[PDB]
Design a protein around this ligand. Structure first.
Ligand SMILES: Cc1cc2nc3c(=O)[nH]c(=O)nc-3n(C[C@H](O)[C@H](O)[C@H](O)COP(=O)(O)O)c2cc1C
Ligand SMILES: Cc1cc2nc3c(=O)[nH]c(=O)nc-3n(C[C@H](O)[C@H](O)[C@H](O)COP(=O)(O)O)c2cc1C
Ligand SMILES: [Ca+2]
Ligand SMILES: [Ca+2]
Ligand SMILES: [Cl-]
Ligand SMILES: [Cl-]
Lengths: 249, 249
């Protein structure tokens, strides 16, 4: 196993950080890695806002449901789907009307490009010895965040990424059995898939028990069910439309 | 610069492959890397279908607009957003109704998780000396692909990833100036952003010229405008709804 695979497979989110600053040089490397990754039609439909201002970062933390690690870490990166540069290219440089944003295809393009960026940044940062944790909660109060960071039309927040020096390196969290996630040739039959999930549940409860010394024993399906039983963010379509993205009829 | 950063920043898509097989051990490492990456609420909302059957892979290539490198390479991975395992967890294991899929938030969760997976797989595969190229065209004929690979309700294709041994390692393609993609504290003013795009255009035309010996000189904005002037995939919402994903009202 080479250094890259070793680094990728040793991943774990960090939520306890020291006050040590993150060198600009390291941030540059992380950004270079992000830019170097693939993107649909080389459209580079993702923008990264680097926030290091204490006051601004604190406000972001509050908008994200008040997550202390955001305030604690020296760096907060915001990954946004971006079709504004595309708008400039089509409308301003070639006097063309941009139509891709009038259908969900644009949303998928932006979200996938942003995920590639987030995953790449995570890999890069952690290879440098830095700890990270994505923040999907930025989608909880998108309008306020959009105004705070001056995100223009055709740009919308997808996920933040906390970066800093770990104060506690934590531990790896068990993942679903490989067979349940990677299927050969065709999608796995429902019965077998269910069996893998039930086995995973036992593994997860045991993990949580010894991890929390008994404070928490919830398994995986119980956790997933506690979140998805309600559409926790019912304002997504509204956010998208307000940012110039239309859902095709 | 460490090995990870060096590998990430040396990325370039490969579209010419040899007939050399991809070792199962390498595929396992790539998959382990994918599974080890972060996912929203550890929901692992992405599934990877590994296709190595010549006939099936050929059909996929045809559905993707007939891209020869898909047929040529020994491995085709399909990254799908997956809320079917979530369905099993909520409905079958806890008798709860899944509501997250009734709003676009689920679509964003799945697309971002899949992008993280795709970016991570790309990084892993290339670190092994393998060439890769994502295939967003899988979204062109989703119904046929869904039927071919037996994708159940709550699962939808986002992007394929071709993997194999390079026959031609190609070359790196210029990216937008860092300042145009990574903004400090707030989103970059429109005027400056436009200037960066125009500078990038000159860089791109020059690159294409010497790269194609003159056969092609199109710049970036011209390329982007040639694609986004129309909603090329106007059937996305339909695909999503057919797969159990609803757009909130
Ligand atoms: C989501 C996604 C979908 C893509 N779809 C295709 C495709 O269908 N066919 C193809 O040849 N390249 C595809 N690509 C590759 C891009 O064209 C390529 O990443 C971009 O031009 C940047 O060049 P590079 O990867 O060599 O650096 C895709 C990339 C991404 C991230
Ligand atoms: C898109 C996305 C959004 C996330 N949002 C948050 C968040 O708002 N707060 C948080 O503490 N963790 C967040 N996480 C981290 C997940 O909880 C974590 O990746 C998952 O539990 C797996 O644990 P691990 O990363 O330590 O391996 C997010 C991860 C992803 C990929
Ligand atoms: Ca079956
Ligand atoms: Ca401004
Ligand atoms: Cl492309
Ligand atoms: Cl989470």
């Amino acid at each position: 196993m080479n250094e890259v695979i070793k680094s990728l497979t040793d991943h774990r989110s960090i939520r306890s950080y020291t006050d040590e600053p993150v060198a600009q040089e390291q941030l540059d490397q992380i950004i270079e890695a992000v830019q170097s990754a693939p993107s649909s039609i080389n459209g580079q439909q993702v923008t990264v806002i680097t926030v290091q201002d204490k006051e601004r970062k604190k406000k972001i933390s509050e908008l994200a449901g008040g997550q202390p690690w955001i305030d604690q870490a020296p760096v907060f990166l915001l990954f946004c789907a971006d079709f504004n540069r595309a708008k400039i290219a089509l409308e301003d440089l070639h006097d063309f009307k941009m139509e891709i944003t009038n259908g969900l295809e644009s949303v998928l393009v932006g979200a996938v490009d942003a995920g590639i960026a987030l995953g790449t940044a995570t890999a890069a940062a952690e290879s440098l010895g830095l700890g990270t944790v994505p923040i999907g909660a930025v989608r909880g109060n998108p309008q306020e965040l959009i105004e705070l960071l001056e995100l223009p039309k055709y740009v919308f927040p997808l996920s933040g990424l906390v970066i800093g020096h770990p104060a506690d390196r934590s531990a790896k969290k068990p993942r679903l059995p490989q067979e349940a996630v990677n299927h050969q040739e065709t999608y796995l039959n429902q019965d077998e898939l269910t069996s893998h999930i039930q086995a995973y549940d036992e593994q997860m409860s045991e993990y949580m028990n010894k991890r929390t010394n008994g404070k928490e024993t919830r398994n995986w399906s119980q956790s997933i069910a506690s979140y998805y039983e309600r559409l926790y963010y019912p304002h997504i379509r509204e956010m998208l439309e307000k940012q110039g993205f239309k859902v095709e009829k």
